[PDB]
Amino acid sequence: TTEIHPSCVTRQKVIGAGEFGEVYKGMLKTEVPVAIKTLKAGYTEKQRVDFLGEAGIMGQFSHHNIIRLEGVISKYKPMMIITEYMENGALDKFLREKDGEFSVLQLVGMLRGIAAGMKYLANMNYVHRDLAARNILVNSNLVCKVSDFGLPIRWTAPEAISYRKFTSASDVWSFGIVMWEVMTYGERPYWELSNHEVMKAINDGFRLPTPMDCPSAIYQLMMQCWQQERARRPKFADIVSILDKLIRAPDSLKTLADFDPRVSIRLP
Numbered sequence: 136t137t138e139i140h141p142s143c144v145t146r147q148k149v150i151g152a153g154e155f156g157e158v159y160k161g162m163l164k165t166e167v168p169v170a171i172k173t174l175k176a177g178y179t180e181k182q183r184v185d186f187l188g189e190a191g192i193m194g195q196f197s198h199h200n201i202i203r204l205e206g207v208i209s210k211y212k213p214m215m216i217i218t219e220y221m222e223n224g225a226l227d228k229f230l231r232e233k234d235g236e237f238s239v240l241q242l243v244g245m246l247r248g249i250a251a252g253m254k255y256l257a258n259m260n261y262v263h264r265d266l267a268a269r270n271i272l273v274n275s276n277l278v279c280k281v282s283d284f285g286l287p288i289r290w291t292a293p294e295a296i297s298y299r300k301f302t303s304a305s306d307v308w309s310f311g312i313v314m315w316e317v318m319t320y321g322e323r324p325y326w327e328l329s330n331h332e333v334m335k336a337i338n339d340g341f342r343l344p345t346p347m348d349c350p351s352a353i354y355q356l357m358m359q360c361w362q363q364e365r366a367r368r369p370k371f372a373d374i375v376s377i378l379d380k381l382i383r384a385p386d387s388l389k390t391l392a393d394f395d396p397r398v399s400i401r402l403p
């Protein structure tokens with residue numbers, strides 16, 4: 136893993152919490168903005184194993200749609216994981232703050248990138264387990280980078296909830312939820328339904344309705360991510376292929392799925 140000397144790192148502002156430390160925005164020299172997760176004094180053996188194991192896995196990833204590791208500080212305390220910094224932040228907050236500001240093609244392009252990152256992870260035998268818009272970072276080119284900030288019933292496939300079966304096919308279910316989050320500009324999946332109500336609805340066959348202004352092809356694809364039978368879901372290769380063909384022939388996205396009105400306004 137690229138070892139960074141502590142003299143090259145300056146922590147500026149706290150931006151989150153780690154499992155045994157804080158997460159900071161800072162600068163890296165040898166300047167470049169970075170995010171920094173620390174492992175403070177007193178960490179346990181298991182925490183050190185997990186922290187350095189995470190750095191080791193991240194160092195193996197080299198893909199346009201996966202967060203990039205700048206390096207690690209393991210020879211000095213506190214230990215640190217240092218990544219590139221993504222100015223637009225997490226995707227869920229980004230879309231909620233930019234409601235209605237993007238074209239359908241831009242939104243579908245974000246999904247194509249997330250799917251490409253997930254295809255890479257699945258091919259590398261890495262099961263994400265927490266794919267959601269809150270774990271996807273956005274850069275100033277609108278490129279989405281799959282990440283994992285730590286701790287999701289509403290995003291999780293039935294088999295993963297029921298018997299802890301987490302696979303790339305349960306990640307596909309989660310990706311379908313992410314597609315819905317993107318197309319709705321960050322709407323909470325299932326709205327005010329409780330966790331138990333969500334699972335009951337899913338087991339009874341109900342699924343999230345189409346977002347407003349949503350291409351028919353995109354809704355059909357998210358629906359197939361939500362098949363109860365894990366083996367019937369698309370693989371990420373299938374998802375990337377479909378999204379790539381839709382974007383290439385963008386008139387395909389002009390056909391919209393019918394939106395079910397919740398409110399009726401009658402005027403002359």
Ligand SMILES: Cc1ccc(C(=O)Nc2cccc(Cl)c2)cc1Nc1nc(-c2cccnc2)nc2c1cnn2C
Pocket residue numbers: 150151152158170171172189192193201202216217218219220221222223224225272281282283284
């Ligand atoms: C420092 C750090 C460490 C690990 C990760 C991370 O994504 N790890 C990870 C672990 C397993 C699989 C994958 Cl795909 C990623 C990300 C980051 N970078 C971050 N960047 C950012 C961030 C925030 C705003 C703008 N740019 C980056 N926020 C982070 C984090 C971590 N937590 N939080 C809250």
